[PDB]
Amino acid sequence: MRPSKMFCYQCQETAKNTGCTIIGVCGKKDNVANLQDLLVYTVKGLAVVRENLGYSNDKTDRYIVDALFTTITNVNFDDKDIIEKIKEGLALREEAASKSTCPGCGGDLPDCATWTADSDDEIIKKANSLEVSVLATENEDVRSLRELLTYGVKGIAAYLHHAMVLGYDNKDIHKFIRKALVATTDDSLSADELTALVLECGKYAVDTMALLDKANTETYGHPEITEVDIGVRNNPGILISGHDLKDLEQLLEQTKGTGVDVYTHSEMLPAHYYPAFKKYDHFVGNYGGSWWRQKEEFEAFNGPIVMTTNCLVPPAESYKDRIYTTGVVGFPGLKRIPEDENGNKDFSEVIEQAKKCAPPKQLETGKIVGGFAHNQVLALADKVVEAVKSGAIRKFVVMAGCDGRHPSREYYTEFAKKLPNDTVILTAGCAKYRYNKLGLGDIGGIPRVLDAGQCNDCYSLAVIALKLKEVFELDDINDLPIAFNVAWYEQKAVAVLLALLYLGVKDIVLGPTLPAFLSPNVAKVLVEKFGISGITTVDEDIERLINK
Ligand code: SF4
Ligand code: SF3
Ligand SMILES: [Mg+2]
Ligand SMILES: [Mg+2]
Ligand SMILES: [Mg+2]
Ligand SMILES: [Mg+2]
């Protein structure tokens, strides 16, 4: 028997920073949480069986990343959809096991690789079992390392999903995903071995973000400096949220000539920086702020909303009838975008509904400038280097990552406002919405907020830093005039963090709280070896990061 109805602590908003045990703060109900645990368990067992075979295939690789992504915060609240994904994984595992060359020989397999269920009732019973819970790992430090690795792997999986959607892949990354999953089932490993896998997860996070950067830029062009409207026009619109640029491509193609405009929301803002989307005159602008304001902003938008990935919050009744899910997203009673076997999506029902809607309510007017991904910044490298050498830019501050609901995140807005006028903020991810409309101006034409894009575009921030390290002939990335004051919420941010640690970045400030899934001993290593610190007060952190 489980000791509580559920247990989940994977996001920054976990109850009391110790764990959601009755209902998720995010709205994930206990039955859904337990089914997500079973989906992860099923994926681990599939990984075991494929690793025993010695090879995988494309359908298994895609299933694994999609199943992991299904369990990221604010992606899927639909117990029925999670049950079908569990059944799909069991079928793939049973198919794989039927191909074994040594039926019986391999040492006793873990229960995740052999459990079965022939009805939804039996699936639900297994989901409610102790063995699938996070707390099944009894030692606190092993549990912390296993969960930290798992959440990093979920972040990798999400980015790899998007690359695969675009026709890109890297089987070495999938191999690592399977290795890491299997490691969490292996009681022979020491904490040092798990620590090494966490660092390796950072290595593969860099490789995955490199692959997604390649996929997005080869498909849609390199981001370029762009002014994005944050006001509204006078036509019915469709609002697209999340991160999938291929969904946007198809939505724009299908809305051309219809009288329905398209707007972006939250992590779709960076689509406006890509040449392939800038070409459409009905692509109006970015509506609203980050994900956590969506109940009010989706209502005010009046038109339909298409959610391509996280973050989805349980919808208000006012717009439930006009919000659609695609990809791995799910919520009971929300309509899906129809999709064929080749990944082509049909937005016809959305467009017909949009034509009947009022235009969006104006929330604000003005522009956001962005598009400073790696190609664009490297094209300005002489100007950037000259400003560093003259002291016109004294420090860069990476404030990338995720936004969220906690009012403690007012810290990030006030930190940005208190930064001296010779500093530049480098950003990516929806954390940007705490400071991207502040009107901070420019330094010799270089804006004081440089938005490289989506959270995956932290890759560009790394590429930029490594280019500056080479230009200045420095042996250590940390010798650059760069500070890190990163905000996190969901598991892609864990992958980004691990990527930065693998790249050698020290003294990161991580906030607005530190994860619940770090045990005291694991947190101590992060502090002592990597210099990780939580936020304090704006004034104290400006002093320690900028003025000392
Ligand atoms: S995803 Fe976050 S808020 Fe939701 S149940 Fe897990 S820890 Fe709680
Ligand atoms: Fe891609 S950054 Fe992480 S929190 Fe939900 S959309 Fe935001
Ligand atoms: Mg061993
Ligand atoms: Mg190539
Ligand atoms: Mg309404
Ligand atoms: Mg329906």
Numbering used by the authors: 1 to 548
How do the authors describe this structure?
Hybrid clusters are metallo-cofactors constituted of a mixture of Fe atoms bridged with sulphur and oxygen atoms. The most notorious enzymes harbouring them as a prosthetic group are the hybrid cluster proteins (HCPs, also historically named prismane protein), which are present in strict or facultative anaerobic archaea and bacteria [e.g., the bacterium Desulfovibrio vulgaris and the archaeon Pyrococcus furiosus], and even a few unicellular eukaryotes [e.g., the microalga Chlamydomonas reinhardtii]. More recently, the HCP was shown to act as high-affinity nitric oxide (NO)-reductase, detoxifying NO into nitrous oxide N2O at physiological concentrations, and its overexpression protects cells against nitrosative stress. MtHCP is a monomeric 548-amino acid peptide organised in three domains (first domain residues 1–222, second domain 223–368, and third domain 369–548) harbouring a cubane [4Fe-4S] cluster and the hybrid cluster.
The native HCP from the thermophilic methanogen M. thermolithotrophicus (MtHCP) was purified anaerobically by multiple chromatography steps and immediately crystallised without freezing. The crystal structure was solved by single-wavelength anomalous dispersion at the Fe K-edge (SAD) and refined to a 1.45-Å resolution. Based on the nomenclature, MtHCP would belong to class I, coherently with cluster binding motif and its monomeric state confirmed in the crystal structure. The structure harbours a hybrid cluster in a [4Fe-3S] composition, matching the bacterial homologues in their reduced state. The active sites of MtHCP and the 1.25-Å resolution structure of the reduced DdHCP are superimposable. The main difference is a 1.0-Å shift of the “Y-atom” at the hybrid cluster vicinity, which has also been attributed to an oxygen atom in MtHCP based on the electron density. Because of the unequivocal chemical composition [4Fe 2μ3-S μ2-S (O)] of the hybrid cluster, we propose that the as-isolated MtHCP represents the reduced state (the nomenclature MtHCPred will be used below). A cavity analysis by the CAVER programme showed that the hydrophobic channels are also present in the MtHCPred structure. Five channels devoid of any water molecules were detected, spanning an overall distance of approximately 63-Å (tunnel length from the extremities of tunnels 1 and 5) within the enzyme from an edge to another. The channelling system connects the active site to several openings on the protein surface, and most of the side chains structuring the channels are hydrophobic (57/62), probably for repelling charged or polar molecules that would disturb the reaction.
